[PDB]
Ligand binder design. Structure first.
Ligand SMILES: Cc1cc2nc3c(=O)[nH]c(=O)nc-3n(C[C@H](O)[C@H](O)[C@H](O)COP(=O)(O)O)c2cc1C
Ligand SMILES: Cc1cc2nc3c(=O)[nH]c(=O)nc-3n(C[C@H](O)[C@H](O)[C@H](O)COP(=O)(O)O)c2cc1C
Ligand SMILES: O=C(O)c1cc(=O)[nH]c(=O)[nH]1
Ligand SMILES: O=C(O)c1cc(=O)[nH]c(=O)[nH]1
Lengths: 307, 307
């Protein structure tokens, strides 16, 4: 069977990639992702200038997933642009970059710098609209960001969206996104935002920033992610959907693809296991496809049955 | 040692009650709740006329909790009002009624009928603003509901709120809530809405309504529930917060109370175990308290520690 995905002119060996934020902040991280069995990789959501991020502790591994308030620690746009122009081996896998300016102006200035590298190297942009006020939760601000970034970048790009939990919100988000033809992929989803974990032994929160409030990832998010994937697969047929959330196995990948996902992103589980996970995910998805008699992902993508 | 709670002019033997929707639709359900070791009970979110709800399957138990699209099945407001006025034994425990009119006008008519019974029996109102755009996700609609209900009911009442996932949303919700002094309790939280569960074997969704989309309950929602409880505990200090989400043990109950919860509601776990859980929860909470040297709930309520 084939795990290949053919999108934006590129051939991906498999649908699997890292979720933005995990094993993607430094050059060592990026080499490790490139040397992995992953089909692609994405860089840490970057800012115009370097950020060191939030105070410690800011990450807590849970039995059911993860909580985090990292604070967008990143080496700055110039670092990721340089990796994309001079360091990355595009013969290994295609490269994506996440940009998370804390204002539309910052995002425009960054996006402008990427244009020449995309043209020469094929580096794909994922605009983050779900950085912990979340842009995805204001449909007016979202339109402004897509307007301004579409004009500045002038090239195909995608968007990391916050999870929606309302059918009307799926509709309202789809209506904005469908007014922007340069948005070719929608990544669903970012962390379930602003959760609180408390340790019963010390009666204390487990992360220092934001009084313990942090984004939830892992097993807590699979149902939410699958829903967002399917809702945007159906409402945005002129676009691709990338799945992110709750993937620990080939089974969860299969479910993401069945819901409509082209690429599948792994976060918490990759934070837990390391890049060796990509080799397990390829093997498990292959086994599932072999058992169901699917020869390509295209035979079942978005083909989830309803009653 | 005491698990007692003095709120809303009442004494509650303990903080535990059922979550609206679970063991509260029929009189048999309400008798079993009154006969339980629970401190209170709440009736099913009712509509002006009776409803049979959605087609089957409409509920699916999961390893990590529940997915549901019940469709607000209820025997009509007249039935719940009759239970509150004639059947319910107030010497056993205080009674709550959940009202979920699908319009402002419907809710107004329903709450107007409650006024005389609240005056005579003490029946307490929880207004559902989180029934499957969900009212709580539209702050202008929410203000209207609150304005009209305050006008028509004219007595202290409570609100069932949807889970929020954004700091600005917490602030915006509280701002609306803090303009209505008749709102004395905020129940956080209703289901994490519009999730999607797919069975990998049959490639099919597990609930029939809404193409498989339903509200999530159980272990999936605890960190979200704790966050909303604490956020409204801090932002709405002239009000009480009720905790709802992910309670399967005394541990989860302790955590909710530490975050600010006066009453703790139990849904998915009650569906799984039956009304006996109230006896286990009472015992497990006392155990934790004995092990921590606590005699009353007031010694730890809202005393979650930050760093
Ligand atoms: C430590 C950490 C850092 C993250 N950083 C980013 C980030 O920079 N940009 C982003 O768009 N998402 C970021 N995320 C969110 C993940 O990409 C992903 O959307 C979320 O964790 C859900 O996927 P999972 O269930 O596989 O973890 C981060 C998550 C974690 C745990
Ligand atoms: C079968 C079922 C029916 C529910 N019906 C209602 C309802 O009528 N009104 C309501 O406000 N919440 C309703 N809920 C939500 C619960 O009250 C609760 O907010 C949610 O299940 C999260 O708590 P849990 O983690 O204990 O399940 C329902 C939940 C379930 C599982
Ligand atoms: O860097 C972070 O804090 C971060 C960014 C983002 O978009 N999502 C997340 O969960 N964390
Ligand atoms: O009856 C239902 O469908 C229902 C109502 C509500 O408020 N919440 C929920 O999860 N289900």
């Amino acid at each position: 069977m084939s795990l290949k995905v053919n999108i934006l002119g590129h051939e991906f060996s498999n649908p699997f990639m890292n979720a933005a934020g995990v094993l993607c902040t430094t050059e060592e991280d990026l080499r490790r992702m490139t040397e992995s069995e992953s089909g692609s990789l994405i860089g840490k959501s970057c800012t115009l200038a370097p950020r060191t991020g939030n105070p410690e502790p800011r990450y807590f591994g849970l039995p059911l997933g993860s909580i985090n308030s990292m604070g967008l620690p990143n080496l700055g746009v110039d670092f990721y642009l340089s990796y994309a122009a001079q360091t990355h081996d595009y013969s290994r896998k295609p490269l994506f970059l996440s940009m998370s300016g804390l204002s539309v102006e910052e995002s425009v200035e960054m996006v402008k710098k990427l244009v020449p590298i995309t043209k020469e190297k094929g580096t794909i942009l994922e605009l983050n609209l779900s950085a912990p006020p979340q842009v995805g939760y204001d449909f007016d601000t979202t339109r402004t960001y897509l307007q301004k970034v579409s004009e500045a970048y002038g090239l195909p790009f995608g968007v990391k969206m916050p999870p929606y939990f309302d059918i009307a919100h799926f509709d309202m988000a789809a209506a904005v996104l469908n007014d922007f033809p340069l948005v070719k992929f929608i990544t669903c989803v970012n962390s379930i935002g602003n959760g609180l974990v408390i340790d019963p032994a010390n009666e204390t929160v487990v992360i220092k920033p934001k009084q313990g409030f942090g984004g939830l990832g892992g097993k807590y998010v699979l149902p939410t992610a699958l829903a967002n994937v399917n809702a945007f697969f159906r409402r945005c047929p002129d676009k691709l959907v990338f799945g992110c959330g709750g993937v620990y196995s080939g089974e969860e990948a299969f479910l993401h693809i069945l819901a409509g996902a082209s690429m599948v992103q792994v976060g918490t589980a990759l934070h837990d296991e390391g890049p060796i996970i990509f080799a397990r995910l390829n093997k498990e998805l292959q086994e599932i496809m072999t058992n169901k008699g699917y020869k390509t992902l295209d035979e079942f993508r978005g083909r989830v049955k309803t009653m």
